[PDB]
A paper describes a structure:
The bacterial proteins of the Dsb family catalyze the formation of disulfide bridges between cysteine residues that stabilize protein structures and ensure their proper functioning. The solved structures of both CjDsbAs, especially the length and amino acid sequences of their L2 and L3 loops that are essential elements of the monomeric thiol oxidoreductases, were different from that of EcDsbA but similar, though not identical, to that of EcDsbL, which affected their functioning.
The active site of CjDsbA1 was observed in the reduced form, while the CjDsbA2 formed a clear disulfide bond. This was due to differences in protein purification procedures. It should be noted that the CjDsbA1 redox potential was the highest among the characterized DsbAs so far described; EcDsbL has a redox potential of −95 mV and N. meningitidis lipoprotein NmDsbA2 has a redox potential of −79 mV. Previously, we found that CjDsbA1 present in wild-type (wt) cells was present in its oxidized form, but it was mainly present in its reduced form in cells lacking CjDsbB; also, the lack of CjDsbA2 had no impact on its redox state. First of all, in E. coli JCB817, CjDsbA1 formed higher molecular weight oligomeric complexes (~46 kDa), which disappeared when cells were treated with the reducing agent DTT; in E. coli JCB818 lacking EcDsbB, these complexes migrated slower when compared to their mobility in E. coli JCB817.
Residue numbers in the entry: 4 to 194
């Protein structure tokens, strides 16, 4: 089948596409470079777009990567943007780690401060702003939602696209931008 139905459906996912991704996943990188989410916004300007990092795939600093993406989600939403914008914090944050891993072939980060600072500088924020955010109820809610990314990723791998929190697309059904546009229009308009 071209998609499966999630049960239960995801919270805070009405009128949306969520991409579960890993910064070590070359197909994720390809969608990032290609601008898949920006192009989906172009075709579906009514939808919201969110990245779900898959912590089981993100290595030594996987918990801290989730912290930085949760912050980026919160800040982008505050600013009326989301991950389908090239200037968003979420997109900038994904870019710096994709570049680190795939184009600078950085196997590891020396230590946690070095890892964190790469994300802090990509988002042009200081550590105090992120750590203060992590003590708030909204941070715990956002991180709690990311927990589902691992189970979502086990079905078919990454990236996993999920429409309206309910319909998870089988990657074998996607062979072009047009295919993915067609499935999002079909699935976005079901119950």
């Amino acid at each position: 089948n071209s998609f499966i139905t999630l049960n239960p459906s995801l919270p805070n996912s009405e009128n949306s596409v969520i991409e579960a991704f890993s910064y070590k996943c070359i197909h994720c990188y390809n969608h990032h470079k290609f601008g898949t989410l920006e192009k989906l916004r172009e075709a579906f300007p009514n939808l919201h777009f969110k990245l779900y990092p898959v912590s089981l795939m993100n290595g030594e600093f996987s918990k801290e990567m989730n912290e930085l993406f949760a912050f980026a989600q919160y800040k982008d939403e505050q600013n009326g943007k989301d991950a389908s914008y090239s200037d968003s914090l979420s997109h900038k944050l994904a870019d710096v780690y994709f570049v680190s891993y795939f184009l600078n072939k950085q196997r590891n980060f020396s230590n946690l401060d070095e890892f964190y600072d790469i994300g802090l500088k990509a988002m042009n924020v200081n550590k105090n702003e992120v750590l203060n955010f992590l003590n708030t109820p909204k941070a715990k809610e956002i991180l709690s939602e990311f927990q589902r990314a691992n189970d979502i990723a086990k079905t078919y791998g990454t990236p996993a696209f999920v429409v309206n929190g309910k319909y998870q697309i089988n990657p074998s059904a996607i062979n072009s931008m047009q295919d993915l546009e067609d499935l999002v229009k079909k699935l976005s308009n079901m119950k």
